[PDB]
Design an enzyme around this catalytic site. Structure first.
Site, mmCIF file in Angstrom:
data_model
loop_
_atom_site.group_PDB
_atom_site.id
_atom_site.type_symbol
_atom_site.label_atom_id
_atom_site.label_comp_id
_atom_site.label_asym_id
_atom_site.label_seq_id
_atom_site.Cartn_x
_atom_site.Cartn_y
_atom_site.Cartn_z
ATOM 1 N N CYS A 102 0.807 -1.246 0.000
ATOM 2 C CA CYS A 102 0.000 0.000 0.000
ATOM 3 C C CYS A 102 0.841 1.298 0.000
ATOM 4 O O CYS A 102 0.456 2.312 -0.559
ATOM 5 C CB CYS A 102 -1.055 0.048 1.129
ATOM 6 S SG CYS A 102 -0.345 0.108 2.841
ATOM 7 N N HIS A 153 -2.257 1.440 7.266
ATOM 8 C CA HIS A 153 -2.675 1.394 5.872
ATOM 9 C C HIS A 153 -2.413 2.745 5.210
ATOM 10 O O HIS A 153 -2.754 3.787 5.770
ATOM 11 C CB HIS A 153 -4.151 1.004 5.829
ATOM 12 C CG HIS A 153 -4.663 0.795 4.432
ATOM 13 N ND1 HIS A 153 -4.413 -0.346 3.672
ATOM 14 C CD2 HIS A 153 -5.499 1.631 3.749
ATOM 15 C CE1 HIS A 153 -5.156 -0.189 2.557
ATOM 16 N NE2 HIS A 153 -5.818 0.983 2.574
HETATM 17 N N1 LIG Z 1 1.492 -0.998 5.149
HETATM 18 C C1 LIG Z 1 1.230 -1.804 3.957
HETATM 19 C C2 LIG Z 1 -0.162 -1.516 3.463
HETATM 20 C C3 LIG Z 1 -1.178 -2.125 4.111
HETATM 21 S S1 LIG Z 1 -1.862 -3.415 3.098
HETATM 22 C C4 LIG Z 1 -3.273 -4.172 3.927
HETATM 23 O O1 LIG Z 1 -2.345 -2.786 1.888
HETATM 24 O O2 LIG Z 1 -0.846 -4.453 3.026
#
Ligand SMILES: *NC[C@H](*)CS(C)(=O)=O
Ligand SMILES: COc1ncnc(C2CC2)c1-c1ncc2cnn(Cc3ccc(-c4nc(C(F)(F)F)cn4C(C)C)cc3)c2n1
Ligand SMILES: [Zn+2]
Lengths: 75, 331, 602
Positions: free
Chosen positions: B7, B272
């Site tokens: 993400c 996230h």
């Molecule tokens: N910190 C990474 C993003 C979160 S995710 C659920 O998209 O892996």
């Protein structure tokens, strides 16, 4: 040589360092002043992140150069 | 798509897709690397990987506009191949860990800049190479004034991003840029060593902008040491930013907010990442989205009004997704 | 916090100023000028014309710059403020310190005096103002008597100037806050907060009634204030750069102003278009002191960033121009000679000698370990003289050099003081062995060899000069104790050493136990049986040659066969048999990681 470090609150601190000092020794001196562990620290000079295992001479850090202190925001 | 922990990369790729010239400069560099490969390295895989990501994205945007009844599996859109190239360039991106979106932006921009310098040296051995240097690179003037002898000293240093405090040791973004750039007195344990005085003295220190890029990225320090803590309260973000106050010369240039990267989480160790982007510029329905905002979840694109987006961003409501990177564009 | 040991390499008599002069005073009854220097020394000078040598005495008990001095009690007592955070009381007739006040936390920049109350104020970078009764400050020591503290509070930034009314009824502070603050010292109460300066305020004056203040800022303005109306009543712009020195005649009508522009004016406060240029100085004006032996002041003493103090004659101050560019006096009437400041220091590869360059462009050669000058090299090029004296040797750094006082100050800390082990032969000593010496240890044993607690006397190899000042300070400029090397035998010095000498000095000096040896690891691989090794950092390559010849080739003198049979390589360079592993790791090993060595047969 004296360098400035802009801390998390925007406050500037002074470090006395040598051109042969490694980034890990500079992160230890930032731990001694600001109390942040070297593994959480992240130094930026001239828009490049400083990598652990290199010397301040490799980056052209002179007297009166500024480092920006940041942390990782893990996501 | 997401495909696990990416993400932090997705939010950076989404904001770089809507940057003024990024998508055309990457095409120019990829066409040069393709002409190199036909006439006869790990850095060139990053530009091949970016071009293949960008082409995938235009194929989705077209497919949504004219054939919604297609790409039912979302064509498997993959940053994972770009992430494999960033593993070959940087060991930290190994496995399915979590990372800083600003540290990924620094890695991608640095590796594109090194590729640009490599292609420039190759061409000079026998104008469009300054992609990062036109778009994200600026130049500061760091003045120091010794209060004992009133001598000025200047340092001229480059910047890709402006790292600003979110709270003191509500606020506006002008206050954060004042804490970065306005006059600071260095006093007590942190005295200036003045080579004209041969002595530790108090000094005033000021940072001024001299060359501005087309995109200003503000890196919000949404984190403080109390053992480390995330600052959840935002500061007020203007739509228009003017930097004449901290400028070496007066300039009637205004910068307009066009992207944000947010971090949802109560700790620094996990969260996230989300990106939201204004559509200013790139079949009738494509132009109808202009002036609005796109919010990117893990694989959803939500269209949102500018008023509703700025109400949700303001500290008047609980934001639940702290701003972390603000991108301002030259008007 | 952490106590550092320092000492100063100097001559027994520092007759001339070695740096700039921050403060001046006169005793008109004795015809006697006081000069508080950046060399940490307050000198006493005669100002009678028939005296060929103006020097009278030197008053030396500071460890950093003397920022301000006040002459009090009919010239009998002097008060001194320093960047060593101390305020000192002296006997001005004899020239000795008789008390030290340690109530500040940072540099003390300004003193104030009220003649008609014997009241002195001290201010500094610690935002504190302390008021002192001078008749109360005339106590011999804290053990004979200790005193209380009256404080003025309410300053939000570092104080660069005080002024006190002659009657001790108004005190004014000028700071980087850009606003003058006013109190009544009698009641410790606030009165005013004057606004209108745009930078730091380094000069303040008051008249006798406290009704008017005259202030000079680094913004180039002089402001006259009416303290009865809480406002500025006039502003004068007669300097192109910051105003740092002010003086006023007794009628409070003429102002003598000087600063960074190196000019001195006399402006009439009533008609500021009529000004005169007295003189054009060689360096920024730091302080001025008027001669007050006549109704119109006949002279002005000018202290600068340069080591010379000049008297300028004010006779002939009446022409007609509003800004005359012709100075009244183009030569000083009296010149107090100054010395030269050290402005560059370079520690040689042996970590024992310094090359220094001064303001006169003279290069000097120093021995740290003996605390003495070796030779004066004259006006030779500094970077070429550094190149000529290059030696292929590495010694770990074990001291710092400070030039703040214009003379060598050497500092030792626990972190690195003990990191310099060296052979007696390499350090130029001998007996018929080659023992192993620690330079910080030998220097600490020599620096305080006169302490009764350290006798069994000295290191047995060298003595420092008996006049060498020894300082025990904290990192940050706060001095705890200062003595001369010879004075450690007295009762008061021996008690203050028991209360001040840090344990990291006591272990080596008093308990006579010896510091940790440093060891470096290395790999000994055959050059195209492998193990990781560790040895002393100083091990000669000849003993690594011996170890290879006896451990890898075990099938006449054995050490001659070892050196003539085996070669050592590092980075494809054949090692000198006499090189220490330090010097190999520092010069011949450019690659990262642990040092690797390779070997072959001749
Ligand atoms: N910190 C990474 C993003 C979160 S995710 C659920 O998209 O892996
Ligand atoms: C690794 O993923 C990425 N890497 C770089 N960039 C991007 C995105 C290009 C930023 C992605 C990325 N992430 C997530 C998704 C989910 N679906 N898609 C395709 C997509 C992209 C934009 C749109 C779209 N564009 C518009 C308009 F603004 F042009 F008007 C309106 N709309 C909508 C409102 C109908 C429509 C669909 C994604 N792409
Ligand atoms: Zn200075």
């Amino acid at each position: 040589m004296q360098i400035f470090v802009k801390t998390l609150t925007g406050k500037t601190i002074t470090l006395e360092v040598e051109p042969s000092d490694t980034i890990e020794n500079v992160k230890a001196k930032i731990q001694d002043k600001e109390g942040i562990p070297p593994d959480q620290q992240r130094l930026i000079f001239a828009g490049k992140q400083l990598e652990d295992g290199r010397t301040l001479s490799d980056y052209n850090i002179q007297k009166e150069s500024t480092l920006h202190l940041v942390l990782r925001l893990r996501g | 798509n997401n495909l696990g922990n990416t993400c932090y990369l997705n939010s950076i790729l989404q904001v770089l897709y809507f940057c003024p010239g990024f998508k055309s400069g990457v095409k120019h560099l990829f066409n040069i690397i393709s002409r190199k490969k036909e006439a006869l390295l790990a850095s060139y895989e990053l530009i091949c990987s970016l071009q293949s990501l960008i082409i995938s994205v235009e194929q989705l945007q077209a497919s949504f506009l004219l054939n919604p009844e297609k790409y039912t599996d979302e064509l498997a859109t993959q940053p994972r191949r770009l992430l494999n190239t960033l593993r070959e360039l940087n060991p930290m991106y190994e496995g399915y860990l979590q990372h800083d979106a600003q540290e990924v932006l620094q890695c991608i921009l640095g590796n594109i800049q090194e590729t640009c310098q490599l292609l420039k040296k190759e061409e000079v051995k026998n104008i469009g190479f300054e992609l990062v240097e036109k778009l994200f690179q600026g130049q500061l003037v760091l003045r120091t004034r010794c209060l004992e002898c009133e001598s000025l000293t200047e340092r001229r240093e480059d910047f890709q991003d402006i790292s600003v405090p979110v709270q003191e040791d509500m606020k506006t973004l002008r206050w954060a840029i004042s804490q970065f750039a306005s006059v600071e007195r260095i006093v007590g344990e942190d005295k200036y060593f003045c080579e004209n005085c041969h002595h530790y003295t108090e000094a005033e220190r000021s940072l001024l902008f001299d060359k501005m890029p087309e995109v200003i990225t503000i890196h919000l320090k949404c984190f403080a040491a109390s053992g480390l803590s995330k600052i959840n309260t935002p500061l007020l973000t203007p739509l228009k930013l003017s930097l004449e106050e901290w400028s070496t010369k007066p300039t009637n240039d205004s910068y307009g907010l066009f992207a944000v990267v947010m971090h949802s989480g109560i700790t620094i160790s996990s969260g996230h990442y989300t990106a939201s982007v204004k559509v200013t510029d790139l079949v009738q329905s494509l132009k109808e989205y202009e002036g609005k905002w796109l919010l990117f979840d893990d694989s959803e694109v939500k269209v949102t009004e500018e008023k509703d987006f700025l109400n949700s961003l303001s500290p008047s409501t609980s934001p639940t997704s702290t701003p972390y990177l603000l991108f301002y564009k030259k008007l | 916090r952490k106590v550092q040991v320092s000492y100063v390499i100097r001559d027994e008599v520092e007759k001339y100023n070695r740096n700039g002069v921050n403060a001046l005073q006169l005793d008109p009854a004795l015809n006697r000028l006081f000069t508080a220097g950046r060399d940490s020394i307050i000198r006493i000078w005669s100002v009678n014309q028939h005296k060929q040598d103006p020097y009278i005495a030197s008053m030396e008990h500071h460890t950093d710059w003397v920022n301000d001095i006040v002459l009090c009690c009919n010239g009998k007592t002097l008060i001194s403020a320093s960047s060593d955070t101390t305020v000192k009381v002296w006997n001005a007739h004899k020239g000795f310190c008789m008390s030290t006040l340690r109530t500040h936390k940072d540099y003390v920049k300004a003193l104030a005096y009220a003649k008609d109350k014997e009241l002195v104020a001290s201010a500094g970078l610690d935002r504190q103002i302390f008021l002192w009764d001078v008749n109360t400050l005339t106590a011999l020591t804290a053990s004979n008597n200790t005193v209380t503290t009256s404080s003025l509070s309410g300053n939000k930034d570092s104080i660069y100037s005080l002024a006190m009314n002659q009657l001790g009824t108004i005190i004014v502070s000028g700071s980087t806050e850009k606003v003058l603050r006013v109190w009544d010292p009698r009641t410790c109460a606030k009165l005013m907060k004057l606004k209108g300066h745009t930078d730091n305020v380094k000069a303040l004056l008051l008249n006798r009634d406290g009704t008017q203040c005259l202030s000079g800022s680094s913004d180039g303005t002089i402001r006259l204030w009416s303290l009865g109306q809480q406002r500025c009543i006039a502003t004068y712009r007669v300097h192109d750069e910051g105003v740092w020195a002010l003086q006023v005649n007794d009628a409070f009508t003429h102002v003598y102003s000087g600063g960074r522009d190196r000019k001195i004016y006399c402006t009439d406060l009533r008609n500021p278009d009529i000004r005169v240029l007295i003189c054009e100085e060689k360096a920024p004006v730091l302080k001025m002191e008027l001669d007050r032996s006549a109704d119109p002041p006949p002279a002005i003493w000018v202290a600068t960033t340069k080591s010379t103090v000049n008297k300028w004659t004010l006779k002939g101050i009446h022409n007609d121009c509003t800004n005359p560019i012709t100075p009244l006096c183009t030569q000083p009437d009296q010149v107090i000679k100054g010395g030269a400041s050290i402005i560059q220091c370079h520690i040689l590869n042996d970590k024992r000698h310094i090359l220094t360059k001064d303001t006169n462009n003279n290069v000097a050669y120093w021995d740290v370990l003996k605390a003495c000058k070796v030779e004066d090299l004259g006006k030779v090029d500094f970077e070429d003289e550094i190149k000529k004296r290059f030696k292929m040797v590495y010694v770990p750094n074990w001291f710092s050099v400070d030039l703040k006082t214009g003379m060598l100050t050497i500092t030792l800390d626990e972190s690195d003081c003990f990191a310099a082990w060296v052979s007696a032969k390499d350090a130029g000593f001998s007996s018929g062995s080659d023992p192993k010496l620690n330079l910080g240890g030998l220097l600490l044993q020599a620096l305080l060899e006169y302490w009764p607690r350290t006798h069994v006397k000295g290191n047995g190899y060298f003595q420092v000069p008996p006049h060498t000042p020894v300082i025990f300070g904290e990192a940050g400029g706060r001095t705890l104790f200062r003595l001369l090397c010879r004075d450690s035998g007295g009762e008061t010095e021996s008690m203050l050493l028991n209360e001040t000498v840090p344990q990291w000095v006591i272990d080596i000096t008093v308990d006579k136990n010896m510091p940790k040896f440093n060891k470096i690891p290395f790999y000994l691989q055959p050059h195209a049986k492998k193990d990781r090794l560790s040895a002393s950092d100083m091990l000669q390559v000849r003993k690594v040659m011996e170890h290879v010849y006896e451990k890898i080739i075990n099938l006449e003198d054995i050490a001659v066969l070892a050196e003539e049979k085996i070669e050592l390589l590092c980075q494809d360079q054949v090692l000198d048999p006499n090189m220490d592993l330090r010097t190999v790791k520092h010069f011949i090993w450019k690659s990262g990681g642990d040092l690797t060595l390779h070997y072959r047969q001749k």
